[PDB]
Amino acid sequence: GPRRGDGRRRGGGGRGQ
RNA sequence: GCUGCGGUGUGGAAGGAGUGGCUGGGUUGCGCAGCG
Numbered sequence: 001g002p003r004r005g006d007g008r009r010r011g012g013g014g015r016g017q
Numbered sequence: 018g019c020u021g022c023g024g025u026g027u028g029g030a031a032g033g034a035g036u037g038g039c040u041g042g043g044u045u046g047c048g049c050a051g052c053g
């Protein structure tokens with residue numbers, strides 16, 4: 001549940017770059 | 018912010034996390050979830 005709203009690059013894998 | 022999820026696509030009614038991908042939809046699209 002992200003309360004910041006910034007929206008960081010998802011970890012896990014490449015996806016999020 | 019920090020991390021994770023083949024999970025969802027302009028294939029995900031099939032992989033795998035790039036540990037194939039910086040043209041192939043892509044300098045790893047798009048969303049979602051967890052923690053403050």
